[PDB]
Design a protein around this ligand. Structure first.
Ligand SMILES: Fc1cccc(N/N=C/c2ccc(Cl)cc2)c1
Ligand SMILES: Fc1cccc(N/N=C/c2ccc(Cl)cc2)c1
Ligand SMILES: Fc1cccc(N/N=C/c2ccc(Cl)cc2)c1
Ligand SMILES: Fc1cccc(N/N=C/c2ccc(Cl)cc2)c1
Ligand SMILES: Fc1cccc(N/N=C/c2ccc(Cl)cc2)c1
Lengths: 390, 390, 390, 390, 390
């Protein structure tokens, strides 16, 4: 077995392994669109002859707290043949790509995890939380205090520009926001079309400062699934939910959102917005600890403090945080905080509290005051969301 | 119809309405135990003759942030006869009890809500969050970093003192903690016994600094239900979960816990701790805004700030927060923050962020800096939990 | 094998066959109560030694159209041992009991059928229709036109006399009404008590002119099952349904009622009263055609007409109907209407239209005018209901 | 918002609202076929610009008791945008169409209801009853008395003329019968073809005097669904059911039929024809009370009687019924019967008994004899059925 | 009704009856491929005009114990119109085909049974056993002793020759093996392609001495269905299962195999290979008892013995078995063993033990030693499998 950058002659074998490995395989045509986001030397294959291993990264732009956009290496299309399990092919491919990603100058790498138990050992920590809400809309009444017709029912393919403009503003402002390039808008509006023996037609609700794409479930005809809701203002978010609660032929609206979604609070009965499902969203590997920690903004509310952070096999740093900025410098001084790289990725967008990871002993300190200060500093003012799966 | 304090001759009619209104009716004997927690003039009945309305409060002790214990009026046994719906009996009973609770000097009232849509209009806001985790324990492996035999499998009825001592420490420290009096320990250890055609026998796992009570589900014989886990140290919490993952005849362990429960982080696969259910726990009505706001501790990390808070039909106050303390004084100055009483109850233990209620417009301010400061000040260092249903 | 009246020494063997044959076996004690309704020579057993066959009838009083009460032989406790199937024991027992019932002077016999395919060949026709309604009471609003507190939530065991008085009036007026004797009231109010690992406690709703007994389902705790609703006036029927829709802790009320139950029409949305189940109720065998046909009242609206009815192996009769009365005399004149005895039982209480049985060719005539006249004459002004299972 | 007759430029916006409002949207092509049944000025739209409201009626021919065919306005394609709920758009569209329908000279309007709670307030009463029977055909044996090869298994597209001739006879004779025009036969035989990832191929059973179209369920491969069975004679109805019980690879045959369907009576076990579902079918609004009441035949069996009927905000009439005919004349005399327009629609085809609506107080009289006379007069000799959904 | 060989003008009517009779109808095109396996005079139709009955046989080659290949008449496409049940059409068609099959010189006929109760009376006995195993592959670990990359994940359409070569070796050696002709390979690799709204794409696992075709289930996306696994060596069978347990995105692998499949024994936990389903596979009718009994090999382990076998209405034979060969000669001597033809078919491939059929009295002897000798002689060294459905 040998690991190397694939040739144009290797892609047919990679599409075969993809088809066999991913039930949601977008297909060779759709796969060729995403491929435009893979840089030269962004892919590795293992050959036995035939492709038994593959992995690649895409050039992404990720918004982190303080509205800072980081170049981000998005790992995807990671697959080992069922014939070559337990031969260390994933370890070899991840090591080679991480070397390339580091050398290329990416401060962070990211992925969506097929299973929860794989990526921790390679330094990835779950950094966003997906939260399905199901609304029994038959009972939903808006609170007297709820804002709000500004919303239009439209065909998605006829309003691409308005969606792109809204999404662009949304992402420049929401931790977890990813730049969505033209090819991914092409793929999005193609999935909006009804499929024979497949998904039903998608509709859009369009506000000047928000949109929702939804479709009726293929099997449950009383369930509407919101595939995407992007609102830049509270007014837009409320107006869009008023329109969705107005789908009078539906019993239930389901959406995959984030834990801080205000929808429950718009209703007289908060319990009507049931949390039916929760899962890790985006995973982060901090490739360069000082660059990552210096790049993001921190809470202005916490006062200036200094400490020494050790990342296991990742460096030891003098960390000074004040005025919502951090300085992270090399030091041999005694560490006051110790954690694995994955734990740092989990703190980085503010989705997990340092005191919660401390309680599990994923994060060790002898100063409870230092823990409270970390919790407060790494908190995100704007709640962290999940842009789109890759 | 007339509203008045019940006589000993009214309780038989109240037990009848209870039996008809609550499927989980503890029964007259168990009801007589809880009754020892109802003060003189703690109960109202509506008579037509027969009892068609009832409501009472219990004398409770609730822990709020900064380990402060407030006398708390716990509303319970609230029932209107199915024959007397839509006649304003709940409004009349709640008004009479609130008058008594206020006059008696309780700064806060609390309840568990049979439905999510009733209690908001009477000034109650959901203040804690219940979070069911289900662990597929067949796959659960502890992380290298997880602490840890210190734990003993014991019969609950033979270790009441150790449970009472652990629970007492736990509650003096956890926002949401309630003093559990002797009669409620009597009722707890009676529900620990197996019932003919009912619940199976309960076992306990006992650590010096923690316990878990669990029982196999009556129908699903591969499901263990943890009725209660109280751990005062992280070591205890980990040691108890090691023992529960050691129930090798079970497929699944389920527990009703809080959103900050560190269990997911103790495992190599965080996803094995699935969130199967989420709901409002304790509801709070702030009876006296200045007394409540001055009583709790605030985050030391936020710097001193001053604002003017208006509660709708509940006063306007000069609110100064610094050194983790608040001063709340009467003022006629322009309000910078406005909200209904229920919203204040929802912020009070730190389970809901002011910026999330602001996004739903349940909380109005024109200062984004003031919002960030409120979020940070009302945050609880120790995560808010739910002691026990009443 | 021999067929004979059982001895007191045969009843232990009959209780064994009962226990093995009927999963709902009331038990020997409850069986001894019903036994007080079996006349001397009301029972047959088949012995091989051991009881392998049994059948009995009870002395009942059945209300038929025109508020006429007929002495009725109620067949019950009919069982053949699983060891003696396909040996003609049911045919032999039914023949012997029918001989006794005829000789004793009963104009009609009745039963509830364990299966739909057995009793037709012995001359029994399904004569009432059970109709389960399930109400999603969360959506139920009463119509502006609906009548209507007159209703009290009460303990069943404390209001036996009021229930007995209401039921007695109800039955003297409703085709299908049965006299309920004291022993069956004893058994009814014993099933009202909660059972360990069994049914939950029963409540009653009591109006001067109606009652409902209901209990929450043992498994579905959001379902209330109405075991019995007897209303003598429309006001009572509406008032009782207002109270049942007021069970605010329930999602669904289910009742076994009749097809003409006005409940759907009391609601703004008739569709909320879903028909979840339909089945044959009481079966009738007309033992004496002339006595049965002369005993019941007929519709005053149909004008006087005469015809010749032949029952297959049951006689031929000159049938004259006018002024809501019939004269049925022996004749050898050509038959204008022909049908089997079971078909007559199915027409007798007015639950099945002659034109519907004609369409299936269970009833043969060459006169369409005669068919319309039969339909109209045998119609019941008061809708036919089902009193209680025996 | 403005209400007006749509332009050819408004139909694209109407198809969008249709697609979003009706999951069963036939599609623009199929929608263009039905459109040939909409008269000039048969449609209204509400514009904000974009279509947010629409409603139309089709020119139909409805058979009522006495084989009388009424011109009927069939409301369909009624939709309000989810963005414009609770703005009175349905009330405004229904008022405008009713004005047009009345002025145009239609004595009655009709619809199929998406929900049971909408159309009562606009004067529509449910007038037919859908009744699903499911037969476990493995146990089904025909009764000795059942009639009856006359039936051929055929391809539907090769026998359109025979189906059209049978349906035409059926409808000229069955209350609820609708003329089915050529475009609806085009649409019917297009739904008979198998769809990729959709419905399976349809077969027909053809008798000289009846047909059945059936198809195996897409998911349950042991269930046959009869989409349509039209039989003009009892022989045809029996012969077709013999053939359907002969589908030996099926466990269950399901059909949507009417409550008087004789199928149960053709079997030795009536219980094998289970009622699995019941719902309102066609709804009627009597546009002109005297014209409607004079147009239908009445039962010859009831003797001549006279009364005064008041319809709430719909007139008061001297109503004389005799010789199966009615005369309905204006009067200011005291009303003996009072009811809302919807109630009249529910009585009109004979599916609901006046005494049942009286019991719910939807229909008020102080004469019980008058009630019995109404019940008997409005009864339909031929049972009321449901032709096809529009 | 008349029975005769179909004309080219009868096949359209046969495709109609096929479509109506078989939900799995391959379709006219696929049906035309299989048709190439039907000899001249291999088909009968019954005409009323229209086809109401059909049946045909295909020329097959069946492997029986001792690696002997018998010409085999494979009955298929057997259908009676639902309009012509209970008229003896199946009896008439089976009698005509059996006459032709016998005259043509086939020693055995075979079929797959749509139901278990039809074919016994026509002399067919179930001769193979289908056994579904479902593996929870998340827990599956191979035993230290298990053999074993030799296996390649490949596209089925690119490796037809290798599959054909492996299948050919497999079938020349496995009792139940059928020659698979080119047209059936054409049909197999066409079902390997993904279908719109139908089955997902098929993958293959290819070893020098084995293959598996599998596809993910259309509904359960965590279930892989192995459509076919053919392994000529134990190494191949183990290597293929190692690869299938390596489908890490699946929870469950299901396969239809035989009762002696060694898979359970390859795992440390035999219980992980759950038997979820069992059914009769191939049915045999011995057309010529002496030819069939002399053709197969017998166990060398049993010593030479002689007996007299009577088949009910099928002959009496002197049966001598020794050196794994049988001589079967006509005799009028007293029968020592008696059985129906179907029972012989059930013994013939060694799937059913003579002592088990004796215990049910399907096989009568007064010699227990003779029974043990039959059991041992008819046993198959190589376990009997099921090639493919026809
Ligand atoms: F050839 C390439 C290059 C990059 C990514 C891919 N795969 N596409 C990724 C992806 C992941 C999840 C979804 Cl929902 C949809 C798409 C293929
Ligand atoms: F008479 C009284 C006085 C106070 C409370 C009560 N009811 N008990 C409350 C309660 C609530 C929930 C549970 Cl799980 C268990 C118990 C009855
Ligand atoms: F010994 C006897 C004499 C008469 C009837 C019986 N059985 N009781 C009948 C019965 C039938 C149905 C129900 Cl729900 C409840 C009870 C036993
Ligand atoms: F443009 C128009 C004009 C008239 C009716 C329609 N919609 N078609 C009605 C309809 C209703 C139910 C079914 Cl199953 C099938 C079809 C569209
Ligand atoms: F015209 C003919 C001639 C012979 C057989 C057939 N039918 N094909 C048989 C068959 C049986 C089962 C399956 Cl899975 C697949 C196919 C049609």
């Amino acid at each position: 077995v040998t690991l190397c950058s694939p040739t144009e002659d290797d892609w047919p074998g990679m599409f075969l392994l993809a088809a066999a490995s991913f039930t949601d395989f977008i297909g060779p045509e759709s796969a060729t669109a995403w491929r435009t986001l893979v840089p030269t030397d962004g892919a590795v294959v293992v050959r036995d002859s035939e492709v038994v291993g593959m992995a690649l990264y895409m050039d992404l732009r990720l918004t982190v707290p303080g509205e800072v956009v980081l170049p981000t290496a998005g790992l995807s299309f990671v697959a080992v043949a069922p014939t070559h399990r337990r031969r260390g092919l994933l370890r070899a491919m991840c090591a080679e790509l991480h070397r390339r990603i580091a050398d290329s100058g990416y401060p962070v790498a990211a992925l969506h995890a097929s299973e929860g138990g794989i990526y921790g050992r390679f330094g990835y920590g779950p950094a966003t939380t997906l939260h399905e809400l199901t609304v029994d809309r038959r009972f939903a009444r808006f609170h007297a205090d709820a804002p709000g017709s500004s919303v239009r029912l439209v065909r998605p393919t006829e309003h691409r520009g308005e969606f792109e403009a809204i999404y662009e503003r949304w992402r420049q402002q929401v931790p977890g926001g990813l730049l969505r390039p033209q090819v991914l808008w092409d793929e999005l509006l193609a999935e909006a079309k009804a499929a024979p023996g497949g998904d039903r037609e998608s509709f859009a609700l369009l506000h000047p400062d928000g949109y929702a794409l939804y479709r009726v479930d293929r099997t449950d005809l009383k369930l509407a699934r919101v595939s995407e809701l992007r609102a830049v203002t509270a007014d837009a978010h409320c107006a869009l939910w008023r329109a969705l609660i107005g789908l009078d032929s539906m019993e239930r609206i389901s959406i995959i959102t984030h834990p801080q979604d205000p929808l429950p609070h718009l209703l007289t009965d908060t319990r009507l917005a049931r949390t039916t499902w929760r899962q890790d969203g985006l995973w982060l590997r901090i490739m360069n600890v000082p660059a990552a920690l210096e790049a993001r903004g921190y809470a202005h509310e916490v006062g200036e403090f200094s400490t020494v952070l050790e990342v296991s096999d990742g460096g030891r740093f003098a960390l000074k945080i004040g005025d919502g900025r951090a300085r992270c410098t090399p030091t041999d001084a005694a560490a006051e905080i110790e954690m694995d790289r994955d734990v740092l990725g989990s703190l980085y967008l503010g989705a997990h509290r340092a005191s919660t990871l401390a309680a599990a002993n994923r994060l060790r300190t002898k100063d409870s005051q230092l823990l409270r200060r970390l919790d407060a500093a790494f908190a995100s003012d704007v709640p962290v969301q999940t842009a789109f799966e890759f």
